[PDB]
Motif scaffolding. Structure first.
Motif, PDB file in Angstrom:
ATOM      1  N   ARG A 111       0.926  -1.093   0.055  1.00 22.30           N
ATOM      2  CA  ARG A 111      -0.235   0.108  -0.178  1.00 22.30           C
ATOM      3  C   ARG A 111       0.936   1.331  -0.019  1.00 22.30           C
ATOM      4  N   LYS A 112       2.032   1.048   0.621  1.00 21.34           N
ATOM      5  CA  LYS A 112       2.936   2.265   0.753  1.00 21.34           C
ATOM      6  C   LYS A 112       3.416   2.555  -0.737  1.00 21.34           C
ATOM      7  N   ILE A 113       3.883   1.798  -1.262  1.00 19.97           N
ATOM      8  CA  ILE A 113       4.517   1.676  -2.615  1.00 19.97           C
ATOM      9  C   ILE A 113       3.467   2.294  -3.465  1.00 19.97           C
ATOM     10  N   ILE A 114       2.095   1.627  -3.479  1.00 24.83           N
ATOM     11  CA  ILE A 114       1.380   1.985  -4.502  1.00 24.83           C
ATOM     12  C   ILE A 114       0.622   3.091  -4.526  1.00 24.83           C
ATOM     13  N   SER A 115       0.575   3.786  -2.966  1.00 17.42           N
ATOM     14  CA  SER A 115       0.383   5.171  -2.961  1.00 17.42           C
ATOM     15  C   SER A 115       1.017   6.368  -3.689  1.00 17.42           C
ATOM     16  N   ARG A 116       2.215   5.753  -3.982  1.00 14.10           N
ATOM     17  CA  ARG A 116       2.936   6.697  -5.013  1.00 14.10           C
ATOM     18  C   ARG A 116       2.460   6.919  -6.341  1.00 14.10           C
ATOM     19  N   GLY A 117       1.503   6.067  -6.788  1.00 17.70           N
ATOM     20  CA  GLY A 117       0.864   6.202  -7.950  1.00 17.70           C
ATOM     21  C   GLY A 117      -0.616   6.535  -8.065  1.00 17.70           C
ATOM     22  N   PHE A 118      -1.139   6.865  -6.737  1.00 19.82           N
ATOM     23  CA  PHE A 118      -2.460   7.274  -6.510  1.00 19.82           C
ATOM     24  C   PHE A 118      -2.685   8.679  -5.761  1.00 19.82           C
ATOM     25  N   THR A 119      -1.519   9.419  -6.157  1.00 19.62           N
ATOM     26  CA  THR A 119      -1.443  10.788  -5.368  1.00 19.62           C
ATOM     27  C   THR A 119      -2.565  11.734  -6.118  1.00 19.62           C
ATOM     28  N   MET A 210       5.624  -4.471 -19.667  1.00 19.47           N
ATOM     29  CA  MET A 210       5.681  -2.914 -19.354  1.00 19.47           C
ATOM     30  C   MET A 210       6.621  -2.532 -18.308  1.00 19.47           C
ATOM     31  N   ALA A 211       6.648  -3.277 -17.454  1.00 17.07           N
ATOM     32  CA  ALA A 211       7.595  -3.014 -16.114  1.00 17.07           C
ATOM     33  C   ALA A 211       8.915  -3.172 -16.533  1.00 17.07           C
ATOM     34  N   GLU A 212       9.250  -4.015 -17.194  1.00 17.05           N
ATOM     35  CA  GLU A 212      10.659  -4.182 -17.829  1.00 17.05           C
ATOM     36  C   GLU A 212      11.315  -2.872 -18.875  1.00 17.05           C
ATOM     37  N   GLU A 213      10.235  -2.817 -19.602  1.00 14.57           N
ATOM     38  CA  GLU A 213      10.640  -1.769 -20.882  1.00 14.57           C
ATOM     39  C   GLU A 213      10.412  -0.350 -20.122  1.00 14.57           C
ATOM     40  N   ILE A 222       2.358   6.393 -13.350  1.00 17.43           N
ATOM     41  CA  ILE A 222       2.785   5.905 -12.185  1.00 17.43           C
ATOM     42  C   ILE A 222       3.480   4.884 -11.973  1.00 17.43           C
ATOM     43  N   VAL A 223       3.767   4.053 -13.267  1.00 19.45           N
ATOM     44  CA  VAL A 223       4.553   2.787 -13.198  1.00 19.45           C
ATOM     45  C   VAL A 223       5.946   3.061 -12.931  1.00 19.45           C
ATOM     46  N   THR A 224       6.662   4.321 -13.362  1.00 15.49           N
ATOM     47  CA  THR A 224       7.911   4.648 -13.139  1.00 15.49           C
ATOM     48  C   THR A 224       7.943   4.872 -11.489  1.00 15.49           C
ATOM     49  N   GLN A 225       7.058   5.371 -10.949  1.00 12.94           N
ATOM     50  CA  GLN A 225       6.929   5.764  -9.586  1.00 12.94           C
ATOM     51  C   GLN A 225       7.063   4.542  -8.758  1.00 12.94           C
ATOM     52  N   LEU A 226       6.455   3.259  -9.337  1.00 13.41           N
ATOM     53  CA  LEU A 226       6.046   1.976  -8.740  1.00 13.41           C
ATOM     54  C   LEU A 226       7.301   1.276  -8.696  1.00 13.41           C
ATOM     55  N   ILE A 227       7.900   0.940 -10.042  1.00 10.88           N
ATOM     56  CA  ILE A 227       9.151  -0.138 -10.067  1.00 10.88           C
ATOM     57  C   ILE A 227      10.444   0.397  -9.613  1.00 10.88           C
ATOM     58  N   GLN A 228      10.392   1.744  -8.975  1.00  5.89           N
ATOM     59  CA  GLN A 228      11.573   2.588  -8.751  1.00  5.89           C
ATOM     60  C   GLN A 228      11.871   2.301  -7.161  1.00  5.89           C
ATOM     61  N   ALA A 229      12.938   1.720  -6.925  1.00  6.73           N
ATOM     62  CA  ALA A 229      13.456   1.690  -5.363  1.00  6.73           C
ATOM     63  C   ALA A 229      13.547   3.084  -4.787  1.00  6.73           C
ATOM     64  N   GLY A 233      15.417   1.099  -0.812  1.00  2.00           N
ATOM     65  CA  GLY A 233      15.391   0.195  -2.038  1.00  2.00           C
ATOM     66  C   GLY A 233      13.875  -0.659  -2.264  1.00  2.00           C
ATOM     67  N   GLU A 234      12.833   0.036  -1.838  1.00  2.00           N
ATOM     68  CA  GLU A 234      11.433  -0.438  -1.695  1.00  2.00           C
ATOM     69  C   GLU A 234      10.808  -0.157  -3.154  1.00  2.00           C
ATOM     70  N   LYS A 235      10.411  -1.029  -3.715  1.00  2.00           N
ATOM     71  CA  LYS A 235       9.616  -0.886  -4.871  1.00  2.00           C
ATOM     72  C   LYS A 235       8.791  -2.326  -5.378  1.00  2.00           C
ATOM     73  N   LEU A 236       7.893  -1.946  -6.336  1.00  2.00           N
ATOM     74  CA  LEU A 236       7.517  -3.408  -6.916  1.00  2.00           C
ATOM     75  C   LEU A 236       8.301  -4.147  -7.709  1.00  2.00           C
ATOM     76  N   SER A 237       8.413  -5.518  -7.385  1.00  2.00           N
ATOM     77  CA  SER A 237       8.953  -6.402  -8.305  1.00  2.00           C
ATOM     78  C   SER A 237       8.108  -6.406  -9.687  1.00  2.00           C
ATOM     79  N   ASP A 238       8.703  -7.182 -10.743  1.00  2.00           N
ATOM     80  CA  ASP A 238       8.017  -6.941 -12.082  1.00  2.00           C
ATOM     81  C   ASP A 238       6.749  -8.003 -11.884  1.00  2.00           C
ATOM     82  N   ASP A 239       6.663  -8.940 -11.090  1.00  2.00           N
ATOM     83  CA  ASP A 239       5.671  -9.797 -10.788  1.00  2.00           C
ATOM     84  C   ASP A 239       4.492  -9.084 -10.018  1.00  2.00           C
ATOM     85  N   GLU A 240       5.243  -8.633  -8.680  1.00  2.00           N
ATOM     86  CA  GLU A 240       4.364  -7.492  -8.040  1.00  2.00           C
ATOM     87  C   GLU A 240       3.573  -6.527  -8.924  1.00  2.00           C
TER      88      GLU A 240
END
Ligand code: HEM
Ligand SMILES: O=S(=O)(Nc1ccc(Cc2ccncc2)cc1)c1ccccc1
Ligand SMILES: [Cl-]
Ligand SMILES: [Cl-]
Length: 410
Positions: A111-119, A210-213, A222-229, A233-240
């Protein structure tokens, strides 16, 4: 005295919602047994074989369960209270990979990582493109004279909100909208051939691409703010990220669409409110529409320990099912709850769930989507009239409208 309900009545029965909302039966529990054991015969528990569940029908009890996430678990059985009677337990437990079916601390991290994409900023950046597309959708529908209000008015905008939020290119939105529609309603005969498991797998694979690309070429979605540590170092993994897109594709589709449809059904049945809306365009209507529509009829929790809720002894391991459809019409909280009043202020409905750890993160994206589309409907088809009755969705927890034939001219 026991409530006046038919024997064996299951408030999660999909046969009920295929025809109507059981408004009277909900009002019965609220008055006679506001917390009531909903017994379920063997093999009739929608995928849960524990004998039944506690029906929660008061808004205050709904909010208490949502606040006490420490006791009432989303993870133990998931939050959906009804699947096909023969669903394999493993297919229930695979849902624990999405944030909604998780408990702390796992859910707290996501929820904390996801909150970066629902500001507020991220959601608000979609306002102009969604307002433009809302107007185009209403005009396109009004030019067709008459047709299916569900498909021609309600469907597109919530889906374009997800694509805009996720940064999905225009050539992929039909791919995404199909995957999203392939995940809900599999108990209705019209959707009997959809395969949510297979659609979830393709959506994850596409989301990992999309995450890898988007690590190589960062954008402003929002994707960039999510998969970025962050510094930790906290971020969504590609599967996450995959499991989040799967959750977003489902969460941001049918619930808003049914708000819009049932919002216009309320307006068709309350012309005084419709004239008031077209004149003032009050944004509070969005909340009243969600309170009226209650797209999610119920989500459930499992008690991790004994708990006394409003005099009723909840025993460890039992399920509690929060009937938002009943709580949103609680006479203790709302003045004239069965009056459709688009000026209701304040409006503490639990349409987006009870306040707590799992409160709907797309609530304001939903409110914006609803508000933009109804301004467009008022702009382009202010004198629309239904030509027939809506077809309801056969579902144990989703309040859906499959089709609603409307004349946008008059
Ligand atoms: C009318 C529209 C909507 C309705 C009625 C609705 C309903 C709900 C409800 C009742 C919950 C409660 C979860 C719980 O307490 O178990 C929830 C959570 C959630 N909603 Fe919504 N929702 C809507 C729109 C959206 C949209 C547009 C999005 C995303 C684009 C979204 C994303 C989520 C997510 C991710 C959660 C999980 C939050 C968490 O687990 O921390 N929702 N929603
Ligand atoms: O992703 S899920 O594991 N869980 C899930 C997701 C969305 C919803 C619907 C919803 C709508 C709005 N706000 C919140 C929720 C329910 C449950 C899942 C995916 C496919 C089929 C069933 C469940
Ligand atoms: Cl039936
Ligand atoms: Cl899944």
């Amino acid at each position: 005295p026991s409530p006046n309900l038919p024997p064996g009545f299951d408030f999660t029965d999909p046969a009920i919602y295929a025809e109507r909302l059981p408004v009277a039966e909900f009002a019965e529990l609220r008055s006679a047994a506001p917390i009531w054991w909903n017994g379920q015969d063997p093999g009739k528990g929608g995928g849960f074989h524990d004998g039944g569940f506690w029906a929660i029908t008061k808004l205050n009890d709904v909010k208490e369960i949502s606040r006490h996430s420490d006791v009432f678990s989303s993870y133990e059985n998931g939050v959906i209270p009804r699947f096909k009677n023969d669903i394999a337990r493993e297919d229930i437990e695979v849902q624990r990979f999405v944030m909604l079916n998780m408990d702390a601390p796992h859910h707290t991290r996501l929820r904390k990582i996801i909150s970066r994409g629902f500001t507020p900023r991220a959601v608000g950046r979609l306002h102009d493109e969604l307002q433009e597309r809302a107007q185009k959708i209403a005009a396109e529908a009004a030019a067709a004279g008459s047709g299916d209000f569900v498909e021609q008015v309600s469907c597109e905008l919530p889906l374009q909100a997800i694509a805009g939020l996720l940064g999905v290119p225009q050539e992929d939105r039909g791919k995404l909208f199909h995957w999203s529609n392939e995940m809900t309603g599999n108990e209705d005969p019209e959707y009997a051939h959809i395969d949510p498991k297979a659609s979830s797998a393709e959506l994850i694979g596409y989301a990992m691409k999309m995450a890898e690309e988007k690590a190589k070429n960062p954008a402003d979605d929002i994707v960039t703010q999510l998969i970025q540590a962050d510094i930790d170092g906290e971020k969504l993994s590609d599967d996450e990220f995959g499991f989040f897109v799967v959750m977003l594709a489902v969460a941001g589709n049918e619930t808003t669409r049914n708000s819009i449809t049932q919002g216009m059904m309320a307006f068709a049945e309350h012309p005084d409110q419709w004239e008031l809306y077209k004149k003032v365009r009050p944004e509070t209507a969005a909340d009243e529409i969600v309170r009226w529509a209650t797209p999610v009829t119920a989500f459930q929790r499992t008690a991790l320990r004994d708990y006394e809720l409003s005099g009723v002894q909840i025993k460890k391991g039992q399920r509690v099912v929060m009937f938002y459809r009943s709580a949103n019409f609680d006479e203790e909280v709302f003045q004239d709850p069965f009056t459709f009043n688009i000026l209701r202020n304040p409006n503490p409905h639990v349409g987006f769930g009870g306040t707590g750890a799992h409160y709907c993160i797309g609530a304001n994206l939903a409110r914006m989507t609803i508000n933009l589309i109804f301004n467009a409907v008022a702009d382009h088809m202010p004198d629309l009239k239904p030509i027939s009755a809506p077809e309801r969705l056969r579902s144990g927890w989703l309040n859906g409208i499959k089709h609603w034939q409307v004349d946008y001219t008059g």
